[PDB]
Copies of this chain bind each other. A is one copy, B any other.
Amino acid sequence: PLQKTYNYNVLMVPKPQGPLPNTALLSLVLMAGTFFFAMMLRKFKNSSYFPGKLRRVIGDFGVPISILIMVLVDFFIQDTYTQKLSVPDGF
């Protein structure tokens, strides 16, 4: 939640205990940014702005480009926490 003060001697190895300062808003901004980028690339695919070959090539890769750009944006931020993907170790 959005509170006035947080505790900062919290152990986060298994999972975030207690509220965190900037997680909820970074999550909301990242989701909205990914959606907005997806919609603009979907609309650019059908536009008439570049040569047809390069335009269609860029428009067909809209979702992977937005995902890679967005994830890199999250990778550049160091101190802020964001929930990640986790898979089992082995078969």
A: residues with CB less than 8 A from B are: 2-6, 8, 21-22, 25-26, 28-29, 32, 77, 79-80
Contact = CB atoms under 8 A, between A and B. Distances in A.
Contact of A8 (B5, B29, B80): B5
Stoichiometry, as copies per complex, reads: 3
A19 to B, nearest CB: 10
Contact of A3 (B6, B25, B28, B79): B79
Nearest to A2: B80
The 9 lowest CB-CB distance pairs between A and B, nearest first, are A21-B21, A25-B25, A4-B79, A5-B8, A2-B80, A3-B79, A2-B22, A25-B26, A2-B79
Contacts of A2: 22, 26, 77, 79-80
